[PDB]
Amino acid sequence: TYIDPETYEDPNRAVHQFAKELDASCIKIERVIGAEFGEVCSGRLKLPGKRDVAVAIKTLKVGYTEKQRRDFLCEASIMGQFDHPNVVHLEGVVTRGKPVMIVIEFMENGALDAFLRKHDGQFTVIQLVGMLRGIAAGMRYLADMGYVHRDLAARNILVNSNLVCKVSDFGPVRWTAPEAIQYRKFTSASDVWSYGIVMWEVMSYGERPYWDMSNQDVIKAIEEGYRLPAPMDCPAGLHQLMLDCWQKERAERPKFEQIVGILDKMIRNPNSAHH
Ligand SMILES: Cc1ccc(C(=O)Nc2cccc(C(F)(F)F)c2)cc1Nc1cncc(C(N)=O)c1
Secondary structure (H helix, E strand, O other): OOOOOOHHHOOOHHHHHHHHHHOOOHHEEEEEEOOOOOEEEEEEEEOOOOEEEEEEEEEEEOOOOOHHHHHHOOOOOOOOOOOOOOOOOOOEEEEEOOOEEEEEEEEOEEEEEHHHHHHOOOOHHHHHHHHHHHHHHHHHHHHOOOOOOOOOOOHHEEEEEOOOOEEOOOOOOOHHHHHHHHHHHOHHHHHHHHHHHHHHHOOEEEEEOOOOOOHHHHHHHHHOOOOOOOOOOOOHHHHHHHHOOOOOHHHHHHHHHHHHHHHHHHHHHHHHHOO
């Protein structure tokens, strides 16, 4: 089961429990790939006897306080509790004595929303469904561990060379269930609403949910019963599942295990996605 690292009297204890300390000299930074806390780089990590693995390296820019280090490292305390093929994997951390780092499996194709926009129209229904199935499997794992994501969005899904999609978080009214927006009720059931939004993002190749509508106009429309339509070439049964994820009454939304089951049926018989 997931443990909130902030139930720990000392935040550093959580870091040392769930995140392996790495030797800095075994880490090679190669290129900058992103700009919070510091730069994000790609590189390699040396493993004894094994070939080097490609990693993403999140750095803590120098001049930080004790306090800033704490919040940065909290992420490793969270990540390192998970072990699932559709949840991004923590290799480890450098916490003292050397430049502070979080070291993560490298995901070549980056964030799923930008990836899809770049490859607009290039994936078959079955391929897009495989991507959604991976995300759903990652969420099913997280939900079962008692972890509520709270910011599930295609921008928070990472893609590797093999098109495998993994749940991540880069640290959002249009992705959020109404009960979470209004009453701050964040649960796996509110993550299911977010997932429905992710489904829409994927089937539309990284279009912005609700396009140019203001946050207040999104909230109002949702309250009035508005729901986003099926994207171009999106089968009716996939859109129906989006509609199910977007039920006002959270108890009526499917569970992730049911979502995976439904997508599996679609991968097994592609025709059952239209009905
Ligand atoms: C640099 C980076 C930063 C944050 C994360 C990440 O997913 N962090 C995270 C934070 C809180 C919770 C979770 C979790 F695992 F989803 F629950 C993940 C991953 C990465 N890894 C990564 C790997 N490959 C490419 C990139 C990129 N292109 O930015 C980024």
